[PDB]
DNA sequence: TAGCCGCCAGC
DNA sequence: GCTGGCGGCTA
């Protein structure tokens, strides 16, 4: 699978970005993560912090 | 190898 | 118009 923010780097790792509209479309590089699901979980909290609530995520813990 | 650039495509 | 993702480049 692929994920929101999550970008395969060609040696086989997963970066995670989010774009921040309050900073007028800035990227915010959440880091790099060994697994796609941990890159995607980094995005999960990063979108939640800029939105505060009501977000479109990789692991919505409400379901 | 990671991150940033910068752009492009997609939504 | 914005966000995500591409993709490559450079650090």
Curated annotation (Swiss-Prot):
Residues 2-60 bind DNA. The gene is ERF1A. Ubiquitously expressed, mostly in flowers and rosettes after ethylene treatment. This is Ethylene-responsive transcription factor 1A. Acts as a transcriptional activator. Binds to the GCC-box pathogenesis-related promoter element. Involved in the regulation of gene expression by stress factors and by components of stress signal transduction pathways. Induction: Induced by Pseudomonas syringae tomato (both virulent and avirulent avrRpt2 strains), independently of PAD4. Also induced by methyl jasmonate (MeJA) independently of JAR1. Ethylene induction is completely dependent on a functional ETHYLENE-INSENSITIVE2 (EIN2), whereas induction by wounding does not need EIN2. Induction by salicylic acid (SA) seems to be independent of PAD4 and NPR1. Transcripts accumulate strongly in cycloheximide-treated plants, a protein synthesis inhibitor. Seems to not be influenced by exogenous abscisic acid (ABA), cold, heat, NaCl or drought stress. The AP2/ERF domain binds specifically to the 5'-GCCGCC-3' motif. The affinity of this binding is higher if the seventh amino-acid of this domain is basic. It comes from Arabidopsis thaliana. Belongs to the AP2/ERF transcription factor family. ERF subfamily. It is found in: Nucleus. Transmembrane segments: none annotated. Disulfide bonds: none annotated.
